[PDB]
Amino acid sequence: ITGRPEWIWLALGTALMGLGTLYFLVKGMGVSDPDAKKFYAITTLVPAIAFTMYLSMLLGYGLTMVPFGGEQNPIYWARYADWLFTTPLLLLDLALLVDADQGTILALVGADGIMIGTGLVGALTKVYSYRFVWWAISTAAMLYILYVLFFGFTSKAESMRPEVASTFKVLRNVTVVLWSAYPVVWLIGSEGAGIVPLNIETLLFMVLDVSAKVGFGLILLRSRAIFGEAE
Amino acid sequence: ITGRPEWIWLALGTALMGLGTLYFLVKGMGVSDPDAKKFYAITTLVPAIAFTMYLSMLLGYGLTMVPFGGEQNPIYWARYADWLFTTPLLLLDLALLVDADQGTILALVGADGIMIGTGLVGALTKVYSYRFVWWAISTAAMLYILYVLFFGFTSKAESMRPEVASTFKVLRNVTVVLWSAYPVVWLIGSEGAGIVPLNIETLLFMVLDVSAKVGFGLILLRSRAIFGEAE
Amino acid sequence: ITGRPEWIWLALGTALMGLGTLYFLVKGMGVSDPDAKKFYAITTLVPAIAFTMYLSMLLGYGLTMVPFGGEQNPIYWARYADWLFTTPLLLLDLALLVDADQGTILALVGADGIMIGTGLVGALTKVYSYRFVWWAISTAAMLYILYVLFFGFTSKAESMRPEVASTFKVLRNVTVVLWSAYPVVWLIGSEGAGIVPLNIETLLFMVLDVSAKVGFGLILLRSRAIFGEAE
Ligand SMILES: *C/C=C(C)/C=C/C=C(C)/C=C/C1=C(C)CCCC1(C)C
Ligand SMILES: *C/C=C(C)/C=C/C=C(C)/C=C/C1=C(C)CCCC1(C)C
Ligand SMILES: *C/C=C(C)/C=C/C=C(C)/C=C/C1=C(C)CCCC1(C)C
């Protein structure tokens, strides 16, 4: 473990996901409302999956060596196996909040799958210039997702209950700001231009992951918007 | 790129998927009806996924070498990663048209997954005779899908709105004719008996893919059947 | 085939899955009730997927060599590709029986995916001590699933129709007893401590798989609980 200088951030990430999982799991024990049970299930599944993948990176399983630039570069592929499942679930948390129609949910989940899959292909691509072509395609998918979150979801949330509108507005702003940082970190880090070394990149991804999963869930699961309107 | 003689068809396929994606994406911008939004989301996701996989084949990522017959044979595995996601979506486009029940949809999607997965296993199998065992299992799954499209779906479509019945009949005939050609091309091409060389096989798959995705979508998204009956 | 002593059990498993698939496929031909069609679709898909993966193990495709303990150990990875799709479907068969809410279904399917995925990671892990860490995480996911089947599902089934309550109670007891045996067999077999040799382990998994899929389906598809209450 300790032979890699990024291990501490991996270890910290593992701890912060596991604790977060346990907290959400304890917080949803006394919940009988089926809407709230949906939100608790999705929101608790997110850091549990992230916990397993951070642990696989810490133990060395989720790492491979990819030759590009004449070098063997360490690529943590397990992130993508994380994100493939946790980014649609997070989007589902937003979409159930505003009661989105099924076609918009399918468009969001499909564009997210394209984003993560093309990011994985770009991370594993051996021709150095082609990695940025895949980065550009994935960033276009992200920009579609952010467009849908701003111009199909806010004006839908304004016509619903005021608590779900305010909670959605906060979670939307958190999501857009945090998700936009990931392609920048990928571009300047070890998967892209190699300006930022791998230990600092691992720290940055850990802060982003913990914020976008545990902090997101802390804002969501403390709101009254997850419960059905009942007496 | 240009070192492989099939590259031109890969390039053409990439172009025709991307253009098709853009056209559907522009055509669904002015759509507010939620049924039509479902059909536009599914139908636009299909050539976008196909675009990414054609690009991966063009850049050389979606190709591997499989030893059989004493030879290293070029196998484009990315097709299967395409088809695993795009063939159920296309089937979903048919199933939402006739308002199929959930069990029939689950049977169709599961049989389709078996078809694509056993095709992938047969494409990667190193023992030459076993490749045709997997081909036979996949063809049996295809024949189940075609049976369901003819004897559980046509007599359901006849009791619905006449526009959805005529549009379903056209798309069903297009789907059956185009999908039946794929196991023949696999059997006589480089994955099977090797009678047709890889560049002609790549051309044939490109014509089939463009027809079964973009032409299918052009027939579907121009019909009144995708809209709810409203004044 | 015959060079491996476990081949006979693989062959027997393949036969028993295929026959079981055919029987369910013939038994659901005369079914028009949409609830019963859902149960027949799920229950027939389970041994069909298991058939394909048993065949891949018999032909040698679903086997890889994993170095641990200074040895190259034969690991049948195809089991996990089986279980990833067939264990949620079986859970779905239970969840549709008691009309479970969507959040509970999502929690069950997600915990099941974590169980199978961490089992696969543990099966492929080259550091011998870490294999049991992944075993422990997967067993914790299994214990969550069994908790939900006993303390969120039985008291829901008691308020429904009596035939669905009795059928659910039988299938729940069968499921809990059979599913609890799998981590024990993994732990003492060739993936874990290596006390039981691979041919006996393959026999044990074949008996468990045939019981938990075909016997489960025989109990389910003979019950009146799968039909809607109609005159
Ligand atoms: C739980 C972690 C989350 C919320 C991860 C979010 C990740 C992204 C929004 C990733 C985006 C990427 C691009 C847009 C292009 C470069 C490749 C990726 C995968 C880093
Ligand atoms: C978008 C492309 C589509 C519609 C692809 C359709 C592909 C099939 C129907 C493939 C079928 C196969 C068999 C039935 C057996 C041989 C292996 C396959 C995968 C080529
Ligand atoms: C169709 C076959 C079925 C029902 C398989 C069930 C498998 C399990 C419940 C597997 C569980 C495992 C653990 C709980 C820990 C050890 C690893 C596994 C994957 C064997």
Author numbering:
A (entry chain A), B (entry chain A), C (entry chain A): 4 to 234
Authors' own words:
For comparison, we also collected data of the dark state. In the dark state, the polyene chain of all-trans retinal is largely planar (C6-C13) with a slightly pre-twisted C13=C14 double bond when no planarity for the atoms around this bond is enforced during refinement (torsion angle −150°, “dark-unrestrained” structure), in line with computational work (−160°). In the dark state, PSB forms a hydrogen bond with Wat402 (2.8 Å).
